[PDB]
Amino acid sequence: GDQRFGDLVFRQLAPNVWQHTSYLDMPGFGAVASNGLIVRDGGRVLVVDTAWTDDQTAQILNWIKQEINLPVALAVVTHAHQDKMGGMDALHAAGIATYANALSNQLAPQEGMVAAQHSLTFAANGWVEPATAPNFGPLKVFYPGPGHTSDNITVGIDGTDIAFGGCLIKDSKAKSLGNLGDADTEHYAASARAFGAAFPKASMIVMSHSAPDSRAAITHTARMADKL
Ligand SMILES: NS(=O)(=O)c1nccc(-c2ccc(CO)cc2)c1-c1nn[nH]n1
Numbered sequence: 151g152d153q154r155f156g157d158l159v160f161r162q163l164a165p166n167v168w169q170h171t172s173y174l175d176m177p178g179f180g181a182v183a184s185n186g187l188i189v190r191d192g193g194r195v196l197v198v199d200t201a202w203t204d205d206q207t208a209q210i211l212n213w214i215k216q217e218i219n220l221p222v223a224l225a226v227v228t229h230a231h232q233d234k235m236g237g238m239d240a241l242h243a244a245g246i247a248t249y250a251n252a253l254s255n256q257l258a259p260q261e262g263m264v265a266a267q268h269s270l271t272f273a274a275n276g277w278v279e280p281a282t283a284p285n286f287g288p289l290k291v292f293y294p295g296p297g298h299t300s301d302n303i304t305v306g307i308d309g310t311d312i313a314f315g316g317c318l319i320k321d322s323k324a325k326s327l328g329n330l331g332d333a334d335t336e337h338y339a340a341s342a343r344a345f346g347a348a349f350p351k352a353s354m355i356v357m358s359h360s361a362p363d364s365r366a367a368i369t370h371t372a373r374m375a376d377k378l
């Protein structure tokens with residue numbers, strides 16, 4: 151079943167993949183859960199997204215040391231908002247190499263985030279320029295276009311049925327696209343479909359604010375966005 155370490159919750163999704171879940175109480179909304187991933191790649195671990203805070207991100211790392219007991223080689227963060235990048239200082243203090251879209255790093259000061267140590271860039275078709283994402287193992291990084299934010303990125307896990315849509319994708323039973331304050335309403339639908347087309351074989355779609363879902367999450371998000 152699910153495991154807890156401090157304020158964090160961990161769910162095993164596949165033999166080498168776990169989902170990390172952290173919570174932040176928002177003054178007039180209550181607790182909001184955010185999800186990221188932990189991937190075991192041979193003798194090392196790869197992390198996708200921080201928790202909301204530095205303390206919560208340190209809890210992820212200590213759970214990894216306790217449960218997997220393999221070095222964390224790198225972390226990829228999916229856009230410059232608190233749920234995804236709020237724990238950058240904890241990753242840096244633990245000596246983990248950090249990667250984010252160049253645009254996330256450029257927006258990070260205005261967004262109140264700490265930039266990653268390295269910038270990822272992308273081809274016109276959305277795929278990460280390989281020279282900018284060295285030794286990423288099974289992590290396949292894809293920029294689907296502007297949607298939840300202009301800098302949002304996605305990641306597939308090679309050798310699994312998993313693709314991570316971060317905050318771009320909502321579950322198949324979602325009634326709204328969430329916070330559209332920094333969103334591109336014109337391009338959102340095409341970006342949601344581009345994520346789906348980049349990872350055609352992925353049958354488990356992991357996202358930031360809902361539990362893992364089928365490909366139905368991709369099409370239902372795109373239909374909601376078509377109405378924007
Ligand atoms: N990453 S963020 O800074 O923009 C953010 N911060 C806090 C809370 C939410 C949030 C999550 C779910 C819902 C349910 O409809 C509403 C808001 C988000 C959000 N919205 N969409 N993706 N994430």
Ligand SMILES: [Zn+2]
Pocket residue numbers: 229231298299317
């Ligand atoms: Zn966001």
